[PDB]
Amino acid sequence: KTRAKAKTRSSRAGLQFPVGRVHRLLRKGNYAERVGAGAPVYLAAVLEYLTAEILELAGNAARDNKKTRIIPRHLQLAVRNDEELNKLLGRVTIAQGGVLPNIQSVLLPK
Amino acid sequence: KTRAKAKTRSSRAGLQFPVGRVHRLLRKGNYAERVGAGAPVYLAAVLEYLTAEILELAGNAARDNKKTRIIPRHLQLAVRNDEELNKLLGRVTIAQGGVLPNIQSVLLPK
Amino acid sequence: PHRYRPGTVALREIRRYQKSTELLIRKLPFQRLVREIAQDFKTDLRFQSSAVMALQEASEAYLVALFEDTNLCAIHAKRVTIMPKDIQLARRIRGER
Amino acid sequence: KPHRYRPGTVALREIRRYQKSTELLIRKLPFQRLVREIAQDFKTDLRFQSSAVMALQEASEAYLVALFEDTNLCAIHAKRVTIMPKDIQLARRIRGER
Amino acid sequence: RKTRKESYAIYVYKVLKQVHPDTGISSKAMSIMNSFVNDVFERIAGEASRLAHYNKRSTITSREIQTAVRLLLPGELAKHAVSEGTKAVTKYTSA
Amino acid sequence: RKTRKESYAIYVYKVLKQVHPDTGISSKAMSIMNSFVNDVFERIAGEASRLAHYNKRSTITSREIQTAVRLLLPGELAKHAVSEGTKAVTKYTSA
Amino acid sequence: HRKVLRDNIQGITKPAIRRLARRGGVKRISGLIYEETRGVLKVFLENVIRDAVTYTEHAKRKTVTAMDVVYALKRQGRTLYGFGG
Amino acid sequence: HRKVLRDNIQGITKPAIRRLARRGGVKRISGLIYEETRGVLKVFLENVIRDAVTYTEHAKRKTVTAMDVVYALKRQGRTLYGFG
DNA sequence: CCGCCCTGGAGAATCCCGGTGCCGAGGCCGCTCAATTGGTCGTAGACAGCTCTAGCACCGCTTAAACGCACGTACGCGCTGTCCCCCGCGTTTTAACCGCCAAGGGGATTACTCCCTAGTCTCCAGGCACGTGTCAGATATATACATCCTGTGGCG
DNA sequence: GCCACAGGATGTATATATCTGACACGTGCCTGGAGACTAGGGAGTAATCCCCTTGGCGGTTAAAACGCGGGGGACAGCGCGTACGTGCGTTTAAGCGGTGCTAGAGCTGTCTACGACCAATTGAGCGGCCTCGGCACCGGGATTCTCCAGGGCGG
């Protein structure tokens, strides 16, 4: 049938994250009785920004490690070397991400 | 429309806490789409048991303090003296409750 | 002269303040501190007396717990004196710093 | 003359090696046996997913490494380089576990 | 004449009377008790919501509440709470 | 044929292509990223629901999400996330 | 009356910090403890008041309430009993 | 198929605890550290496994899944990334 | 004067590069389900008017507490030394791991069906709000009780 | 050159009286919980497919156990000099009480737009399957870290 062209709300808002999927996950998650029109757009934008920031830092870490693929070690290095990312993910353990190289000054051999 | 005499569900289940009020709070808290019939009864019974336990300990503390009225100091004494209540309320500050009287052994004189 | 030894009055104060239940910080100075801090967040703010008292109770409980942990660290280092390094170690282990 | 490294250089080398690496430091079969023995007390005839046991092992190792960092901080605070059961006890007590 | 603010004041007073027949409770202690009851209600109901979401259910049942109680309350508190909840539920279903 | 499951894998890959055109992602790292997206979604949605309930509202709006972001994310992360969200909502409303 | 307050952290006097340490069980206090305690208290208050003011601003109110303070503390995982419900 | 395991806490050997301490950044280790570490690990695993088995029993399943462990850790406030 | 101190190779571990190879990241395709279009409706929310509680501001006073300074004693910190416990390493024993195989218990799905919960209307009674009058509690005070600190008796 | 404590000196639990204010009780009233009913879909149940978990078996070798030497450091002892606790005289501003003002919290009544809902379309991404190179590994070589056996001039 002849209706308007199906333009996704992600493209309408200029995002790469699924506005419709975020809207469904907010509606079906039993968070409130109603979900606004701008709430999925705002939440998708925030999720996209955070994902972009962590991916940028992880790609920089992978490049510094002479590799072209992001691995859990690279994600851990990015998160624990960015101060605000470490603040946001302080109580989060990344699988097979290891720990940062941090040997105490007193333990250093002098 | 004189129907049958009403019976409170607290009296039907042998409880003091309000089963109907607990049911309404469960239904209006966005906790789930549907709420079972026995869920308010169980939750109200658990709340009444916890209230009775903490009130019994606080009344014992008040009696030991030679007073006939429970105050926040007595509530704090009861909670921090009962190991399980302390573990349940470990991330809780009781207003105007003070602290448990303890002095370290190395800080004691000799 | 009846000067007490250095620590008997301290122990007496410990017992007194652990027995009591009041607020150890002066209400007007603490309220002014809260208002000064809140100036930087939103100008022309009004605080309920209940709100100021809630902040004071929370702050005093936090500081008392931190001083308990600080005393634990100082005794671990085999000292009866608490030190800023004791405070820093307690906060670092708790995850605040 | 036989060669012998001084006490501390090999330990530092191990510290660097294990901080740079990211693999599990506990044998999988013994850890799985311990997990199953512990879970026996809670529900008999239990089965486990391999991913479940791996999650338990990774979480436990992360917890133990964090606890050892805090223990090292306590030992340094006490003017020592050796970690001790009292250091572990203080770390847990400050963190709220004891 | 203003909006009524509900509280568990009378229920906590009844429980106190049935436990200690000759004991009172000050206004501050009553407020702390109301906050404690609301806090435990929130804990248990949030845990029950998480359980219902995890099991892809859309209902909070006595089983969900009991599992939430076991998860939250430590040890003997969980055992006694489960026993009392079961007793109350059976006494309700009998009537 | 079994039930199909949803994930943010393709969206995270598209964002990675936008940011670093010559970088790839392993399966485990993609799973960790999906868990991270889910955790941030859960935190923000929970905080916004708390705000809606504590203001006696019944709608999750862009204002609720903005307040939740400002409460959860620290400092510059929160400031930049607020800017990105406001820009996205303005574009969505203009379109 | 438009007035500005400044440097009230010195309003938390040395005797007040001493009393807090005494309630904490501390028998002897170093002289540098007081400024460290003032800094810690200021950081804690800033963190709590930021969230309380955020809640108030969201509520389109100009009055910070005890319930807003309680919500901020609960956000920090420091549940406070006795200031509402 | 009834098998009862016992004294498996010794499977966490001294060199394994040394590797964990090295990863943590520890130079020297006292002799009594290993028993203390085994006890700490045992109590941690007991708590996490108890919560996981509670979730499993509520689900009416018989095998402890990875999501059960993840939810147990989340109940403990120890979010683990990479298992769903 | 003598231990104490300053140094370049030897051995081992780390780094560095090149060839091999694989399996896991990555593109691509039909296809079903979830997102998108488009009217409806009734309610959540926006807003203007209004009431009065409650927060802010100020004056005076009364004094409790904060401030400041002298003194000295207990304490943090540094130095030496003893020995003992942990580290480094070589050798032997152990079982973790890897590969493959089998089978069966249990996860996950799919109809279906009925009973359990949402939703409504009504009623009445349990519970909130509001007076109020007294009894538990704070306080002022004289205790006698409980606890700390130094000289005086005492000698080897 | 120390050991016990008697008694002074001071903090403090006890008993008595005297307000006093808020806590518990009663009572009118109102809105929300219970009774009774209908409607529909959520979950219980039963049968089935298959997958992945456990158990077994064998070979390899990586790791753990174990013993031994020795030296790094933990801990005790001792000393000393700064620094914090104790206490008393000054001061200041906190608490309280009282009055005044008004700003904003709370409520109420209309009214609007907006989001849930539902019918219908369609394309987006999950699943599954080829396909190639990024990274682990083995082989080989250069560099570097660390430690020990010679040269040296010091108050």
Residue numbers in the entry:
A (entry chain G), B (entry chain C): 9 to 118
C (entry chain E): 38 to 134
D (entry chain A): 37 to 134
E (entry chain D), F (entry chain H): 27 to 121
G (entry chain F): 18 to 102
H (entry chain B): 18 to 101
Pull verbatim passages from the article behind this deposition.
Interestingly, OGG1 was recently found to have activity against nucleosomal substrates when the 8-oxoG lesions are located off the dyad axis, particularly at SHL-5 positioned opposite of the histones and out toward solvent. This observation led us to wonder if an 8-oxoG appreciably distorts dsDNA in a nucleosome, given that the DNA has already been sufficiently bent by wrapping around the histone octamer. We inserted an 8-oxoG at the SHL-5 site of the 167-bp Widom 601 histone binding DNA sequence, reconstituted the nucleosome in vitro in the absence of the OGG1, and performed structural analysis of the 8-oxoG-containing nucleosome. We collected a cryo-EM dataset of 4414 micrographs and derived a 3.3-Å resolution EM map of the 8-oxoG-containing nucleosome. This resolution was sufficient to build an atomic model in the 3D map by referencing the well-established nucleosome structure. We found that the local DNA structure at the 8-oxoG-containing SHL-5 site is virtually indistinguishable from the canonical nucleosome structure. Therefore, we conclude that 8-oxoG does not appreciably distort the local DNA structure even though the nucleosomal DNA is bent. We have shown that an 8-oxoG lesion at SHL-5 does not appreciably distort the human nucleosomal DNA, and OGG1 prefers to bind to DNA ends at the entry and exit sites. At a minimum, deoxyinosine itself causes a global nucleosomal DNA perturbation, in contrast to 8-oxoG, which not only maintains normal G:C base pairing but also causes no appreciable DNA distortion.
